[PDB]
Amino acid sequence: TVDVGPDSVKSACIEVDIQQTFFDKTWPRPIDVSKADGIIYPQGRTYSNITITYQGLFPYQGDHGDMYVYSAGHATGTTPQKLFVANYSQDVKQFANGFVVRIGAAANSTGTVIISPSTSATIRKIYPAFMLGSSVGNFSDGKMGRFFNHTLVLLPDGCGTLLRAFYCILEPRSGNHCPAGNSYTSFATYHTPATDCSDGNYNRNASLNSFKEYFNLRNCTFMYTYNITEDEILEWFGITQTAQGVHLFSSRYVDLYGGNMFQFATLPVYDTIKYYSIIPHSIRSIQSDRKAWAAFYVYKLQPLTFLLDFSVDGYIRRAIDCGFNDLSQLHCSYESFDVE
């Protein structure tokens, strides 16, 4: 067991307003394998200026994945009222191979806020939060989405400057608007950009404290932290699991203007992850000061065979999914990008 800090001093955790209708939209960003989208680089080696077939864990060509949006909270003038979240916490999915996430795709563009449909704004990259586990059941009122004995958790903090991963067994707290308490809707994290998002010092525990208000981290295990440099560039994040633990991938430390994902961490999680879920996150900003947070897309991974093209610098700039259609099968059979 490892020390993570003090528990929450507040008893009444904040209220969250679930309205799935505001978040139910369409923004198609299918996997385009012709520009090597969501490709995890072969994690033993590298090549130069060739084209080869390779068996690994890739997503389906043309897959649409699942979209998720994060929204600001309710605020009257200069006072955030409550949190605006979707029902993601109730939506438990299967892990079964891992997945990849496309973060910041719709950046440097003009979109709209979620809680204010008639409000144009420039979109800002935001980072997702995941909670993965080995056993899932119901909450206090039979609400789906409770995670048992050990739950790996990945959550960004400090206005998207760092990422933290930990076991930290979850213990639902009993109080107002809280999981184990009365009048429970959904747990969620939050950060107030008025105070926490200070240029001099970004509070690196704001989201951790928000999470602490709903759960009591007990018998906690490894609590790492990885530093992220701010920008508005599209990036990729992958996660798989083997006998060596849980592998974490990203394209920030090696390929930043590309997207090829390289391993950057390994976790001592040796229990078989069978379920995962997104963690909702609302921004307690001022009603007159709200931004648009780019949606992120999650695509599953499968044991497929791909035709990858490595360039001179060793990066995969294009690939072909051998099992997509008949032309793809022809391309892979000759293992070339030009078929007579």
């Binding site: 077939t53 068996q55 065979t305 059979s333 000759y334 293992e335």
Partner: protein, 49 residues
């Protein structure tokens, strides 16, 4: 009688070896480019014919 051709035959290597069963497909997938060589040889023979 002077023969000039033979019958042109192509086989579907994947379906001949496994005939639809998904379990056999994964087992054959790690055999790599055998079926591809068979298909390319047959295609070349038919083109020459």
């Amino acid at each position: 009688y002077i023969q000039t051709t033979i019958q042109k035959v192509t086989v579907d290597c994947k379906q001949y070896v496994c005939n639809g069963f998904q379990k056999c497909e994964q087992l054959l997938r790690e055999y790599g480019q055998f079926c591809s060589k068979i298909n390319q040889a047959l295609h070349g023979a038919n083109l020459r014919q």
